Amino acid sequence: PAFVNKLWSMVNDKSNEKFIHWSTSGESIVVPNRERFVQEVLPKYFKHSNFASFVRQLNMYGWHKVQDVKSGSMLSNNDSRWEFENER
Amino acid sequence: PAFVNKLWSMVNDKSNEKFIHWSTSGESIVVPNRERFVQEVLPKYFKHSNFASFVRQLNMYGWHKVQDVKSGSMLSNNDSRWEFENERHA
């Protein structure tokens, strides 16, 4: 339960709003920019950790990456934007 | 903003009275029971939304949770009762 408590301490603290937050339209957790999140927030809650380790723990607790929507004529996706949903 | 319009269509519609309403005393919005609100009202205005997401939007528009008054010898607070005040109307 150590991970979960840190997860909520992180997501439900408005001071982290710019790096990770509940989605406006939906019930998912959004990390607008992966690199910024790893730089600014991860070190504050998870010492000596990286994004892959973080995602592996999120997956262990039911949260998975949402399939990104391919945008425009280039069918582009911002690889740095990550959204997670819970199996519920 | 689209959110604000939905907020008022929700709060000022007498049909939602039991789940969310202007307070009798003060100038705040009261959600007597969080769980019931999420089950009965939220879906009608915000499809696929949860309480945290709703509160995040409220905060964006100046509404913040009121400091809970601790009751009796147990210093208790009903975690399911939420009252919101607007920074512009203290």
UniProtKB/Swiss-Prot annotation, chain A:
Residues 1-87 bind DNA. It is found in: Nucleus. Exhibits temperature-dependent phosphorylation. Homotrimer. Homotrimerization increases the affinity of HSF1 to DNA. DNA-binding transcription factor that specifically binds heat shock promoter elements (HSE) and activates transcription. Belongs to the HSF family. This is Heat shock transcription factor. The chain holds residues 195 to 281 of 677 of the full protein.
